[PDB]
Amino acid sequence: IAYLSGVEGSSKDLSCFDKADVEELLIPLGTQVGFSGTDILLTSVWPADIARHSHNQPSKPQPGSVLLSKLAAHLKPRYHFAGLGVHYERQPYRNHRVLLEPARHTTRFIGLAAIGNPEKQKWLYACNVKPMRKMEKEELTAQPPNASEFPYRELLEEIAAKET
Amino acid sequence: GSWMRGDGNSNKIMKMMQAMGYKPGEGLGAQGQGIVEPVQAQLRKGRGAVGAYGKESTATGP
Amino acid sequence: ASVDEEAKLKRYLEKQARKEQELKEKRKAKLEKLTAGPAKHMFEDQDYLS
Amino acid sequence: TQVSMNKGNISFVRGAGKTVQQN
Amino acid sequence: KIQINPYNNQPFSNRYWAIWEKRSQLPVWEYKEKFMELLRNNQCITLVGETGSGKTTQIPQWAVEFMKQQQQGQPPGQARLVACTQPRRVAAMSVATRVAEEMDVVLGQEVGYSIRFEDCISERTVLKYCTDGMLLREAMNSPLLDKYKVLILDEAHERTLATDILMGLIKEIVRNRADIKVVIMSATLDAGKFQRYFEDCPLLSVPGRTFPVEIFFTPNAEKDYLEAAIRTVIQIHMVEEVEGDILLFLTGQEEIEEACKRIDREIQALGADAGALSCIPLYSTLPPAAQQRIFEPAPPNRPNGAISRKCVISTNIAETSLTIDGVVFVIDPGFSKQKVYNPRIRVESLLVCPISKASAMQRAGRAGRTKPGKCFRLYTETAYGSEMQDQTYPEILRSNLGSVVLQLKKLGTEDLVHFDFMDPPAPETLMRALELLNYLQAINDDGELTELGSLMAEFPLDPQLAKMLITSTELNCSNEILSITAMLSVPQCWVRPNEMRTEADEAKARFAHIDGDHLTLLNVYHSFKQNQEDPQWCYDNFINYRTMKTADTVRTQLSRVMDKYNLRRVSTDFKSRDYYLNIRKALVAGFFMQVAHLERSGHYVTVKDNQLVNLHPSTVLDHKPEWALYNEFVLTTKNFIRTVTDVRPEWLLQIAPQYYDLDNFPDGDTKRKLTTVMQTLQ
């Protein structure tokens, strides 16, 4: 698993993360036990807007983290649990353009609610995982039906244009 | 315009739109909501898809 | 001149690039055109037809 | 080859999906 | 629990309960109680609901109960019906068969259909499916639709000439017969223009698709769409891991037969690794056996796991009413051929034109019937919003109104210039229509239907043809002319698979009569009769077996029509000198306006309108006749006059006296030729 705690910010407080934090989280790009990437991702805040190209929309027009998009944007994680603000099962998304390049494993993002939220029940998500050290491509990557295009594809090109 | 008038019979055919009472230049329909240039159609330039022949489509009314 | 020669060289190379599919097609186009041979004549001798 | 680009229509402002099959 | 079937007094059969469960899960079902209230409260309703929303099957059934409840506690009064129109014959049948199951009664008995050439009613029928033209065919005898209580004009989006006429008269009916309910259904989301038109009638929106669909665009605008479409097909075949067939929309046979060939080339290059792709053309004039392929299932795929797929390449026939199962990839280049009839020059066109904001949806909506799916449009999203118009024109803003004006005159519309069309025809077209009818003696100069005209309306034909056929009975050639009528009222019977063009054209030559395409069709019809109507003989000679069996049906119907008005079927003796002479004269009686002459420049110009035309290369003529009678002025790559016929100019002056009256003519070559002939005849 990979994890980054806190809210995107420039302060050296334990409650905030910044570009440098995401970068040194991102640091192990070589194949450390063959390592391509993680099964699960735990963050507080939402990325820069999951709602783009989503087959449903979340109940609130949430803004969210440009940076954590970047960390997903190569982590390509099987799952992304995001705290704060609202429940939301976003339906899946692919990790490439379609038709241009071979299939690769799809993420699903899952927003959770607060305990005692004014709607009650949904805040707890009960689920299986199975790992990318024992799963294989003919099970790991076969595009599960509801798959959408990559939500940060557009913004990566925009955010790259200044920053990288 | 009936760019078609001459003929001894040409003139009756308007005069039926005058006996059923047109108001020339105007708008076939009922309240009156007509078109008044019949729908026209030109050669596409070839095969570029829905745009790079420069806004020259043959449709003129939803 | 450096701008013009860079463009001209590029356009020389781009015409030379994939100089085979066009040539093989244009050879193919010519070949099939000749072999198709007789088009219908549809003569006009209307006074004979009268 | 051809460059894909998306533009999809929204279904609903809603809150569930794949998880029963994802589980 | 034993419920009794109210229609036949039976217990509802064991099958019904199972079906009942599934139909309860159709989206429209929740609205059932809600619909009845509206129907009880209002005279007109507009209803809208996407495909798969169950409208067509549930709504007419709910109409039936509402009729019954209105008979409960009244005496059993005069038998009244609920009508449901359906734009296409295949749809009117496929609905009824399902709906005769759902109501657990025998088809044709309480639940029926009434399409062309087949009536499935009985005196116990309450709910009648009919094609749109048949509800137009009934009104012409009974203007207030007297048998009907609840009408239901389905699939309004298709805006067919039958439907546009109906709507106006039916709103006229909504005056007068102030007891009859109308429920206009549309399957497209359309911008409530229906809601206005019918006096702000209540609009009911019902959602209900089966699966969601993904939409895609190219970011740049490719300049050669067929190269793109072909390239797109290959790309999908190689990269998509989901099983499914590709449905590519092209413009027509010149392309769907090219696209098959070129896609076969690249799959023969990709060799053993790639799965087998099977390319199936599909256009409306393929013979039955070639159509039937689309039902074929895919290979079992290659052993390496490469997905084999079927690629159906099709005109807009795959957009509506034809339901191709198994499609999960739609490639939409965004074009269709659209007829547009230019009333100034009588040029009927067939150009490649951009589809509409609706049509784009309907093409995409093919995906998402069996599982979620993807639609790839070869145009850019900005292109979509700003060049494609929002809905494609109705039929009425596009076609010749001869057939329609005569129908409206028979229905007792005198006031055509105030007729309440939802989207009125162009002023210039109607002026051709009245002018067409006025030469033909259909209408007198004060515009009343003349005796000859009223008979012309009775034939399921175009006005020109009806004038031919009637006039053929006084020339002693009606049995021969009846067939040349029948063949021209069905979609053309020549088959030409481009893999076999030379052999198929050789078959066409063997039929060919010397004097043109109209005698060539009579030769074709006779040859079909001589061979006991054996399907095989149709095949090897490249004649659609659908067209001829449709054609022979049309002929039988027209015979029945002739008998009811005492038009004797006759023939000239085959031994006589007059036999092939009397045939050509009858043609000239009725297509006398649509005649060309061969100017000294080597081109034809059409009589009076000086429009420059060429013999359409399909003609079995081997000569340019000096005066050419033609049935269809076509724009494709050039103006082409199709179905060309040699006529002799003496016939033109004798048989069609009004139009070729010399004193009116535009001064030019046409006049110069005609003048000399009249002096010669005198």
> CB-based contacts of A48: which residues, under 8 Å, 6+ apart?
A63, A64, A65, A66, A68, A69, A152, A155
Torsion of CA E263, E269, E270, E274, to 10 degrees: 70
Check if the beta carbon of residue B30 is closer than 8 Å to that of residue E419: yes
Answer for the pair E569, E562: CB distance below 8 angstroms, yes or no.
Answer: yes
Any residues with CB less than 8 A from the CB of E118 and at least 6 apart, and which?
none
* Residue E205, strand partner residues: E48
What is the rounded distance in angstroms from the CA atom of residue E412 to the CA atom of residue E574? 43
Do E628 and E621 form a contact (C-beta atoms < 8 A)? no
E486 touches E525 (CB < 8 A): yes
Cβ-based neighbour number of residue E129 at 10 Å: 30
In single-letter form, the type of residue at position E514 comes to I
Supply φ then ψ for residue E356, to 5 degrees. -105, 160
**Phi first, then psi: what are they for E415, rounded to 5°?**
-90, 75
**E625: chain C residues, CB-CB within 8 Å:** 46, 49
Please give, one letter per residue, the 3-state secondary structure of chain B.
CCCCCCCCCHHHHHHHHHHCCCCCCCCCCCCCCCCCCCCCCCCCCCCCCCCCCCCCCCCCCC
Q: How far apart are CA C35 and CA E641, in angstroms?
A: 29
Q: Are strands A108-111 and A16-17 parallel, antiparallel or unpaired?
A: unpaired
Q: Which two tokens stand for residue A116?
A: 């005692």
The count of CB pairs under 8 A between chains A and D is 66
Cβ atoms of E605 and E576 closer than 8 Å: no
Residue pair E46/E204 in contact (Cβ under 8 Å)? The answer is yes
Amino acid in position E558: L
Question: Using CA atoms, how far apart are residues A148 and D8, in angstroms rounded to an integer?
Answer: 9
Determine if residue E199 is labeled as part of a ligand binding site.
Answer: no
The tokens for E19 are 């079906």
DSSP E338: E
For residue E597, list its beta bridge partners. Answer: E605, E627
Closest CA to E176 of E203, E134, E146: E146
Hey, is the C-beta of A102 within 8 angstroms of any chain E C-beta?
Answer: yes
Helix (H) or strand (E) holding E612, with range, is strand E612-615
Distance CA(E518)–CA(E82), nearest Å, equals 43
* Residues in Cβ contact with B54 at an 8 Å cutoff, skipping those fewer than 6 apart: none
Contact residues, D window 1-23, toward E, CB-based 8 Å cutoff: 1-9, 11
Spatial CA neighbour of E506 closest among E542, E548, E535: E542
* Contact (CB<8Å) A145/E372: yes
Q: What is the DSSP string of A101-138?
A: S---PPBEEEE-PPTT-TT-STT--------TTT--HH
Residue keyed to tokens 């009569």: E513
Residue E202: DSSP 8-state: P
Q: Closest by alpha carbon to A23, among A81, A53, A89, A67?
A: A67
Tokens (6 digits) for C2: 């450096």
Nearest to E251, CA basis, from E219, E225, E232, E215: E225
Q: Quick one: tokens of E105?
A: 């009664």
Dist. CA E390–CA E15, nearest whole Å: 44
Phi then psi for residue D21, to 5 deg, are: -75, -30
E1/E651 Cα distance (integer angstroms): 77
Pairwise CA distance, residues A56 & E446, whole Å: 64
Q: After which residues is chain E broken (C to N over 2.5 A)?
A: none
- The answer to whether the annotation marks E114 as part of a ligand binding site is no
Q: How far is CA E522 from CA E199, E408, E482, in A?
A: 51, 32, 9
Q: How far is E173 from chain B (nearest CA, A)?
A: 16
E55 is in an annotated binding site: yes
Q: Would you list the DSSP string of E547-561?
A: HHHHHHHHHHHHHHH
3-class secondary-structure state, position E663: helix
Beta bridge partners of residue E362, listed in sequence order: none
Sheet holding A79-82, edge to edge: A2-4, A41-43, A79-82, A108-111, A88-89
Q: How far apart are CA E557 and CA E24, in angstroms?
A: 42
Dist. CA E421–CA E44, nearest whole Å: 17
**CA gap E261, C32 in Å, rounded:** 16
Nearest CA in chain D to A87: D15
A159 neighbors A66 (Cβ within 8 angstroms): yes
Neighbouring-strand partners of residue E241: none
Nearest CB to B51 within list E379, E414, E661: E379
Report helix, strand and coil shares of chain E as percent, to nearest 5: 40, 20, 40
Pick the residue of C44, C45, C50 with the most E CBs within 10 A to test the interface with E by mutation. Answer: C44
Q: Any CB–CB contact under 8 A between C32 and chain E?
A: no
Chain D neighbors (3+ CB pairs < 8 Å): A, E
Q: Which residues contact A159 (CB under 8 A, 6 or more apart)?
A: A66, A69, A70
Cβ contact E430:B28 at 8 Å: yes
Q: Interface of chain D against chain A, CB under 8 Å?
A: 1-4, 6, 8, 10-19, 21-23
Residues 6+ apart with CB under 8 A from E347: E341, E611, E633, E634, E635, E639
- A86 in Cβ contact with A111 (< 8 Å): yes
Tokens 């609920």 appear where?
Answer: E82
| Chain A residue closest in CA terms to E238 | A99
The dihedral region occupied by E326, where left means phi > 0, alpha psi between -120 and 50, and beta the remainder, is left
- How far apart CA E315 and CA E461 sit, in angstroms, is 26
Residue type, E488: L
Distance separating alpha carbons of residues E440 and E393, to the nearest angstrom: 29
Backbone angles phi, psi at E132, to 5 degrees: -55, -40
Query: Locate tokens 């069709």: which residue?
Result: E521
Of all helices (H) and strands (E), which one includes residue E48?
strand E44-49
Output the CA–CA distances (angstroms, integers) from residue E310 to E184, E251, E279, in the order listed. Answer: 38, 19, 6
CA atoms within 13 A on the CB side of E602: 3
Residue E634's contacts (CB-CB under 8 Å, 6 or more residues apart) are: E347, E348, E349, E350, E616, E640, E641, E642
Amino acid at E582: N
Neighbours of A139 (CB within 10 A): 10
CA C45 to chain E, closest CA, distance in angstroms equals 8
- Is the distance from CB of B32 to CB of B20 less than 8 angstroms? no
DSSP string, E103-162: TTS-BTTTEEEEETTEEE--TT--EEEEEHHHHHHHHTT-TT-TTEEEEEE--GGG--HH
Q: Which two tokens stand for residue D11?
A: 């279904």
Query: Are residues E346 and E401 in contact, defined by beta-carbon separation less than 8 angstroms?
Result: no
E430 at B interface, C-beta within 8 A: yes
Between E215, E220, E381, which is nearest D3 by CB? E220
Q: Residues A101, A113: contact at Cβ < 8 Å? A: no
Query: Under a CB-based contact definition with an 8 Å cutoff, are residues E524 and E541 in contact?
Result: no
Q: Burial letters for B28-51: b for 16+ Cβ neighbours within 10 Å, e otherwise? A: bbbeeebbeebbebeebeebbbbb
Q: How far apart are CA E555 and CA E479, in angstroms?
A: 10
Pairing of strands E627-629, E595-598: antiparallel
Instruction: Write the CA distances from E664 to B5, E437, E647, integer angstroms.
Output: 10, 18, 22
Does residue A162 contact residue D19 with C-beta atoms inside 8 Å?
no
Cα(E83)–Cα(E154) distance, integer angstroms = 10
Put simply, whether A100 touches E (Cβ < 8 Å) is: yes
User: What are the CB-based long-range contacts (under 8 Å, 24+) for C43-48?
Assistant: C43/E622, C43/E623, C43/E624, C44/E598, C44/E602, C44/E623, C44/E624, C45/E623, C46/E598, C46/E623, C46/E624, C46/E625, C46/E626
Q: What are phi and psi of A80, to 5 degrees?
A: -140, 110
List, edge to edge, every strand of the sheet that includes E81-86: E118-120, E111-115, E127-131, E81-86, E148-153, E181-186, E44-49, E203-206
On chain E, the residues whose CB falls within 8 A of the CB of A106 are: none
Question: In terms of Cα–Cα distance, which of E158, E146, E230 is closest to E187?
Answer: E158
End-to-end CA distance of chain B: 23
Q: Which two tokens stand for residue A45?
A: 């805040």
Segment (H or E) for E277: strand E277-282
* CB atoms closer than 10 angstroms to residue E611: 18
Q: Which of these, E312, E326, E331, lies nearest to E243 by C-alpha position? A: E326
Question: Which residue in chain C has the smallest CA separation from E624?
Answer: C44
SS3 A147: coil
Which amino acid, one-letter code, is at E91? Answer: A
Mapping DSSP to helix (H, G, I), strand (E, B) and coil, where does residue E621 land?
A: coil
Residues 619-638 of E with CB under 8 A from B: 635
Separation of alpha carbons E573 and E598, rounded Å: 33
> What distance in Å separates the CA atoms of residue E328 and residue E383, rounded to the nearest whole number?
24
Looking at residue E407, the DSSP 8-state letter turns out to be H
- Pick the closest to residue E493 from E431, E549, E442, E411 (CA basis): E549
In whole angstroms, give the CA distance from residue E26 to residue E56. 11
In chain E, whose CA is at the least distance from the CA of B24? E427
Contact E134, E114 (CB under 8 A): yes
CB neighbours of residue E203 within 10 Å: 16
Taking the C-alpha atoms of residue A14 and residue A18, their distance in angstroms, rounded to an integer, is: 11
CA distance E391 to E168: 20
User: Rounded to an integer, what distance in angstroms lies between the CA atom of residue B24 and that of residue B18?
Assistant: 9
Q: Radius of gyration (Cα) for chain A, nearest Å?
A: 16
Backbone conformation region of residue E346, classed left if phi is above 0, alpha if psi is from -120 to 50, else beta: left
- Label the pairing between strands E148-153 and E181-186: parallel
Tell me which chain A residue has its CA closest to the CA of residue D18: A91
Residues of E in contact with D8 (CB under 8 A): 214-215
Contact indicator for E88, E321 with CB cutoff of 8 Å = yes
Number of C-beta neighbours around residue C17 at 10 A: 9
CA neighbor of E447 nearest in space, from E409, E421, E404: E409
Strands (E), E355-493: 373-377
- Which of D3, D4, D21 has the most A C-beta neighbours within 10 Å, making it the best mutation to test the interface with A? D4
Which residues between 168 and 227 in chain E have a beta carbon less than 8 angstroms from any beta carbon of chain A? Answer: 212, 214, 216
Buried b (16+ CB within 10 A) or exposed e, A102-121: ebebbbbbbbbbeeeeeeee
In sequence order, the 6+-apart residues with CB closer than 8 A to the CB of D10 are: A54, A56, A57
**Solved using:** cryo-EM
E562 Cβ partners below 8 Å, 6+ apart? E473, E478, E482, E568, E569
Residues in chain D: 23
Compute how many other C-beta atoms are within 10 angstroms of the C-beta atom of residue D12: 8
Place of tokens 């106006």: E168
- Paired with E628 in beta bridges are E596, E646
Q: Does the CB of E621 have a partner CB in chain C at under 8 Å?
A: yes
Longest dimension (CA), chain C: 72
Q: How many residues does chain C have?
A: 50
Beta strands in E386-490 (DSSP E): none
Chain E nearest CA to C20, separation (Å): 17
Contact in structure between E585 and E489 (CB atoms under 8 Å): no
Rounded Cα gap, residues C6 and E478, in angstroms: 78
Residue E194 three-state SS: helix
Q: Given the DSSP bridges, would you call strands E627-629 and E645-646 parallel, antiparallel or unpaired?
A: antiparallel
Pick from D1, D4, D11: which is nearest to E216 by CB?
Answer: D4
Paired tokens of E411: 């229905």
Strand partners, E246: E311, E329
Look up residue E575 and give its two tokens.
């031994």
Rounded CA-CA distance E109/E625 in Å is: 56
| Nearest partner of E277 among E292, E259, E255, E251, judged by Cα | E259
Q: Phi and psi for A43 in degrees, rounded to 5? A: -135, 155
Distance CA E386, CA E363 (A): 19
Q: What is the DSSP letter of E28?
A: G
Q: Which two tokens stand for residue A108?
A: 């699903």
Give me the resolution in angstroms, 1 decimal: 3.0
Query: Which ranges of E240-352 does DSSP label H, i.e. alpha helix?
Result: 253-270, 288-291
Chain C contact present for E601, CB below 8 A = no
Type of residue at E515? D
